[PDB]
Amino acid sequence: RNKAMINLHIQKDNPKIVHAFDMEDLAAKAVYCRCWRSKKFPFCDGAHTKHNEETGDNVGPLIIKKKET
Amino acid sequence: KAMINLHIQKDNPKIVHAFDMEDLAAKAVYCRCWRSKKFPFCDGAHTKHNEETGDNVGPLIIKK
Ligand code: FES
Ligand code: FES
């Protein structure tokens, strides 16, 4: 009946987890976690697969690429 | 174990978004909470989510 947290474990000493990157620093491809289960947060490490299988969810990452380095 | 995404595009078995930086404006704010009405962009819905659940999630920002 009570709504669940999305992030169970990550950096709980931080009252609001925000990441901010400059485009100029970006790699050719970055894969960012939107499931809060990655062990390498804020990057996606495939943990969303286990999460989706265990919970029936359908979440996946955000991919940011550069057309040119 | 509870789902994270409650309502967004449930006919897609795994929601992935991919963008090229050259297409972006000087600032893009991406939702990591699956509560935005403008998903995949952040509309501030994370604030209510954090308030109601005690969570601490927030967006990912790509800026110039
Ligand atoms: S590990 Fe979280 S979206 Fe892939
Ligand atoms: S609305 Fe989801 S992270 Fe801001």
Query: CB burial class (10 A; 0-12, 13-18, 19+) of residue A19?
Result: middle
Token pair of A43 as six digits = 């990057």
What technique determined this structure? X-ray
Half-sphere exposure of A50 (CA within 13 A, CB side): 8
CB pairs under 8 A, 24+ apart, for A38-44? A41/A10, A41/A11, A42/B60
Outline where chain A has alpha helix (H): 47-55
User: Rounded to the nearest 5°, which phi and psi values hold at A60?
Assistant: -150, 180
DSSP label at residue B48: H
Interchain contact, A68 vs B12, CB within 8 Å: no
Its domain, for residue B28, covers: 1-64
Specify the pairing of strand A29-32 against strand B27-30.
unpaired
Q: A-chain residues within 8 Å CB-CB of B5?
A: 57-59
Q: Do A51 and B5 touch (CB under 8 A)?
A: no
The total number of structural domains that make up chain A: 1
CA distance B50 to B37: 16
The three-state secondary structure class of B46 is helix
Residues in chain A: 69
